[PDB]
Amino acid sequence: FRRDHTSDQLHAEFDGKENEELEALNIEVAVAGRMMTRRIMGKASFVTLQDVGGRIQLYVARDDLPEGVYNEQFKKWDLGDILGAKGKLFKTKTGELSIHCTELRLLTKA
């Protein structure tokens, strides 16, 4: 659980599997850091987050647990501080590596 978190092991694993499966094992990753892109349409949006500057994309969604401290919240992140977060790893094109932004511990760095 670290930063657009760990997965050396699932790319080795996740990569191939069926949904059910993808899940069965599922890791909800993210963490910290910061970024710059939003992909809004009012509610549940898609964002692109990283750290130092080499991002991955997330899926800020208010579909099941219809949270906020969202994409906007994301819009809001600054510095001094930083994010702590988790989204699920899920199907971008096949069923791997994109984040599905759901629970964030987004404030501090420190």
Distance, in Å, from the CA atom of 110 to the CA atom of 86, rounded to the nearest integer, reads 18
Which residue segment(s) compose the domain that 24 sits in? 1-110
Report how far residue 82's alpha carbon sits from residue 68's, in angstroms, rounded to the nearest whole number. 17
Rounded CA-CA distance 100/54 in Å is 17
**Which residues are 58's β-sheet partners?**
47, 99
Q: Report how many domains make up the chain.
A: 1
CATH number of the CATH domain containing 50? 2.40.50.140
Alpha carbon 110 to its chain centroid, in Å, reads 20
The CB density around residue 93, as the number of other CB atoms within 10 Å, is 7
- Calculate the CA dihedral of residues 46, 107, 80, 56 and round it to 10 degrees: -30
If you ran DSSP here, which 8-state letter would residue 16 be given?
Answer: T
Q: Count H helices and E strands in the chain, helices first.
A: 3, 5
| Phi and psi torsions of 103, nearest 5° | -130, 125
Tell me the three state secondary structure of residue 37: strand
Q: Measure the CA angle with vertex 96, ends 90 and 97; round to 5°.
A: 80
Residue whose token pair is 């647990």: 65
Residue 23 to residue 13: CA distance in whole angstroms: 12
Hey, CA dihedral for 12, 15, 18, 23, is it positive or negative? positive
Q: Which of 19, 27, 42, 33 has the alpha carbon at shortest distance from 102?
A: 27
